[PDB]
Amino acid sequence: NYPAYMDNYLKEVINQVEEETGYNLLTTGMDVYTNVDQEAQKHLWDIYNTDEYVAYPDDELQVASTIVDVSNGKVIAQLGARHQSSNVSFGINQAVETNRDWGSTMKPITDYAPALEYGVYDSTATIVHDEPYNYPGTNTPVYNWDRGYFGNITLQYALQQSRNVPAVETLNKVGLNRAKTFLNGLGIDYPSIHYSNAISSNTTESDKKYGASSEKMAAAYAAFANGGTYYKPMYIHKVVFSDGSEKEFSNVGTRAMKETTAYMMTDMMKTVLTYGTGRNAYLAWLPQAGKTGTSNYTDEEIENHIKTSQFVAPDELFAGYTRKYSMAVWTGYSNRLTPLVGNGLTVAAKVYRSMMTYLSEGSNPEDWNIPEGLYRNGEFVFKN
């Protein structure tokens, strides 16, 4: 016996216990104390499944996400699907799956953070370049989502407008090797990294250790929030054995980036919500910061499976965070060939706005404190 709104979460629980102890809570007796927040779950359950919180263009459009306690990697909510009934208790949880492309949300942790963290750029005001450009060593143009080019613009603006050209070039200056290393620090990895990975989590391999999932993303972005510490995602607190003994589960974060980098990424990302691309997930009273993301079709997919000449996309994402809870949201149809259009592309932000509202309607909305080693200067931030 267990509630349906806890299916996905309970599954992850069963696995973590097995991973650490080697025992299966299904074929062995024991009590387990997890990290879930029940009301948060029912709240999340209501958001997906009802029609009171957000306008789903239909009942098929799927949603999946993970909410993490930025201070310790504790997962306090996870829901892999919506309106998807067929009780097969403990099935595939789309919140831990890496089979989907997180697109643009990949920029902050793959190109820009490393850049700042390694000297490439020294200020959010640095002039980057959005001009015609091909993938390094190749003649394949890196096209901006709208086929246009902005010219010289600041780091911030390029991150806030989600321009591709300045992103893949940034990865070039950071170096793939250093970049892949920096990604590991945040819990993400690929069997092999390429320049396309500057704007896509699409990878040759497909274990689980490779790629990005609402789980991994929310834990990666939590490092910005918590100041630069990477916390392994945790679902279980403690497990008392039938024979009296207990096993307590402790997680110890690691320095993923300097505080400076974290603060800087956070400042550029606060602008994403304001005059940036993440406007639909903006809250005047809540000092949060995030990044919107979109993936794209192959070309064979465009010329053979896409009808409308509208703006389409197999995945819409959002990975926002506050001073307390980091949250990564994925949205798309079960079959990537069914596109997201018009009001369907907006669900990722709203779901995030909605949930994050609830999660912070009380608390005491706090802001970040510019760390020693930096100094403001109008819209931007500079290094000493």
């Binding site: 016996n1 267990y2 509630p3 806890m6 309970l10 629980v13 069963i14 809570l25 299904l26 062995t28 007796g29 024991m30 009590d31 387990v32 104390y33 997890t34 990290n35 879930v36 927040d37 029940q38 504790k74 306090i76 607190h237």
Partner: peptide, 16 residues
């Protein structure tokens, strides 16, 4: 045979 799970408020949320 039995295993109980409690949320963060230690209030049992399921029995498996």
């Amino acid at each position: 045979t039995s295993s109980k799970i409690y949320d963060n408020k230690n209030q049992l949320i399921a029995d498996l």
